[PDB]
């Protein structure tokens, strides 16, 4: 409805990924693990799927947010597959 549209990434000088990193990269391991919790519980209550549809970038922010701070890598491949 009125969620944040996102940001225009100047493709001519960065990457959306080198940018995802750069944003997550300024939230000390605290907030990092703090956020992840909010995305742990929010999933347990389904309404989540939608907000992950109309924002595939929020998937990557979360997927990098995980693997990064140790969460999987042999299971990651179980997502696509």
């Amino acid at each position: 409805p009125w969620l944040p549209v996102g940001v225009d990434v100047n493709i001519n000088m960065t990457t959306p990924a080198m940018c995802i990193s750069s944003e997550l990269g300024k939230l000390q391991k605290d907030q990092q693990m703090a956020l992840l919790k909010v995305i742990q519980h929010f999933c347990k209550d389904e309404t989540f799927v939608a907000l992950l549809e109309e924002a595939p970038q929020l998937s990557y922010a979360i997927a990098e947010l995980l693997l990064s701070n140790g969460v999987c890598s042999v299971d990651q491949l179980t997502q696509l597959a």
Binding site: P16, F42, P56, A63
Partner: protein
């Protein structure tokens, strides 16, 4: 050459529904007592208009001009009065009663002679007279017959009141233009028979009698401008009281229809058989007076049958109608419908071609007879082309792809005599139905041999190709018409059409370029206005309609910083899986 006889006959051929023309010829074959000829013509007309009462009347009022003889008149009454031609018109039964009058003297014959004239009168009553409201003329001559009757004995004077009462007790229940005056004569007549037991007879009819008036009133309004006047005498047959070919007063028709719809309600609560009888009477009447109004035949035929059996009925009438209106595309189809129904296939082609031919003729007749009027020459061209499209289709459905094409070819040979619709229809059939996209596209180009300069056709032709996305073809045609189309507006449209086509399947480049030529040749055009056109959707100008009318608070922060949902929507690596997985682990 001053042989108006061999003259009028040709004329009568080229326009056989022009009744007056047969009359003109009759009013000659007669002046020269050419009684061997007068009967051939009069019969020719009979064949085409077997149900035009007056015609039959004008045929009897020509024998009643010389005593009579049940040798000449007998055959005729046989014909028209037959069961296959229920000619139930009053102005005729009168001419029949006149006969059953002379050839049946009351004196000479006697008990059984006079008693025969009742039959005549009586039938006309049960068949016609009790349905037609404006039947004053009749009942009178009949009661006048039951009046002048001089009882000769105890049983005759008795049987006299037996009949006279019946007759009264019968017409005084039917909406008639005399219900009142006849009621003034019944009420007084019952008192010359009983001044103690006849004032109760007048007290059993008042019930129905009145209701008969009212309805006659209702009838009277509905009847309004019901002009009913057809020459019954070959002499009053003026070139004015007889209808011209295909001609009919639209208002007239509707009035008639209004009557029939009234007769349907069945306000006289008559039995079904009679109701049906009644209805049939009025329909017949109608069809006679509006004989050239296809709706009246289509409505009656689809009734005569709509009721009873005999699948042969609907077709029977329809055929007669089609006879009065040979170039009628409604009866043509209505007829090739019944035929199709009784699988009488061949009959389907004939009946439709007949229409084709009559139309084909009316054409050559208008053309080599004042080609100056293009306003009524193209309309004809279209009606022809139309009855060819609706035919070509019917054969493609019944016969097979083959003939479907045979007809198209017939047309193609007719050259510019038809309109672009034919190439546009056959292109459709070949394209969506048979799916022969190659010939479908050839049919069209082929129509270029006579319409490459017809803006209208070029537009329609294009619409097609752009819709189906014939890329090349779409272009090839455009590039070879810009010079061929006059009317600036259909040309303005050619560009608009194709610019949009480029905007849709080409490239800003392909467009821009074309847009350049477009503005070059149409400087006056409006840029923003043409711009809105380029961006239509489902053929609607939403750009003007809807805009240029005058023509989990915390995660919702991450969203506020991450790139836009179009840098990754490219391929979501993880789907619904990020649901059945992040909940547990």
């Amino acid at each position: 050459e001053s042989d108006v006889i061999g003259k009028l006959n040709d004329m009568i051929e080229e326009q056989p529904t022009d009744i007056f023309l047969y009359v003109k010829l009759l009013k000659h074959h007669v002046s020269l007592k050419q009684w061997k000829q007068v009967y051939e013509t009069f019969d020719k007309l009979h064949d085409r208009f077997p149900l035009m009462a007056n015609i039959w009347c004008m045929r009897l009022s020509l024998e009643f001009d010389k005593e009579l003889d049940a040798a000449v008149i007998e055959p005729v009454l046989a014909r028209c009065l037959s069961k296959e031609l229920g000619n139930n018109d009053l102005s005729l039964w009168l001419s029949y009663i006149t006969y059953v009058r002379k050839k049946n003297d009351i004196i000479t014959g006697g008990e059984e002679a006079r008693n025969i004239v009742i039959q005549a009168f009586q039938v006309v009553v049960d068949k016609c007279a009790i349905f037609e409201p404006k039947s004053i003329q009749f009942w009178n001559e009949y009661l006048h017959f039951l009046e002048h009757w001089k009882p000769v004995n105890k049983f005759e004077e008795q049987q006299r009141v037996q009949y006279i009462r019946k007759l009264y007790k019968t017409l005084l229940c039917q909406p008639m233009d005399c219900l009142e005056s006849m009621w003034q004569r019944y009420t007084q007549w019952e008192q010359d028979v009983n001044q103690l037991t006849a004032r109760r007879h007048i007290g059993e009819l008042s019930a129905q009698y009145m209701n008969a008036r009212s309805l006659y009133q209702d009838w009277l309004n509905i009847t309004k401008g019901l002009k009913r006047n057809l020459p019954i005498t070959l002499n009053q047959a003026t070139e004015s009281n007889l209808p011209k070919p295909n001609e009919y007063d639209v208002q007239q028709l509707l009035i008639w229809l209004e009557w029939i719809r009234w007769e349907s309600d069945n306000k006289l609560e008559l039995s079904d058989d009679l109701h049906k009888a009644r209805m049939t009477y009025v329909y017949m009447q109608a069809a006679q007076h509006v004989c050239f109004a296809p709706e009246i035949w289509f409505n009656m035929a689809n009734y005569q049958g709509e009721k009873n059996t005999d699948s042969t009925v609907i077709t029977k009438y329809l055929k007669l109608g089609q006879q009065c209106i040979p170039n009628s595309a409604v009866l043509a189809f209505s007829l090739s419908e019944q035929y199709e129904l009784n699988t009488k296939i061949p009959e389907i082609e004939t009946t439709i071609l007949s229409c084709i031919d009559r139309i084909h003729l009316d054409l050559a007749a208008l053309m080599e007879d004042d080609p100056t009027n293009e306003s009524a020459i193209n309309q004809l061209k279209s009606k022809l082309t139309y009855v060819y499209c609706v035919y070509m289709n019917t054969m493609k459905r019944i016969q097979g792809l083959a003939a479907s094409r045979k007809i198209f070819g017939k047309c193609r040979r007719l050259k510019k005599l038809v309109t672009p619709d034919i190439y546009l229809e056959n292109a459709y059939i070949e394209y969506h139905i048979s799916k022969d996209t190659k010939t479908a596209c050839k049919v069209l180009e082929l129509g270029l041999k006579y319409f490459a300069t017809d803006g209208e056709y070029i537009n329609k032709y294009l619409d097609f190709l752009i819709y189906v996305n014939e890329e090349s073809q779409v272009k090839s045609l455009f590039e070879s018409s810009i010079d061929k189309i006059s009317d600036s507006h259909l040309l303005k449209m050619i560009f608009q059409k194709v610019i949009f086509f480029e905007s849709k399947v080409g490239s800003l480049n392909s467009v821009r370029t074309l847009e350049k030529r477009f503005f070059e040749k149409f400087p006056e055009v409006n840029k923003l206005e043409e711009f809105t056109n380029k961006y239509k959707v489902l053929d609607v100008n939403y750009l003007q309609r809807l805009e240029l009318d005058y023509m989990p608070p915390e995660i919702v922060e991450l969203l506020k910083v991450l790139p836009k949902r179009q840098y990754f929507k490219v391929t979501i690596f993880e789907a619904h899986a990020f649901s059945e997985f992040l909940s547990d682990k």
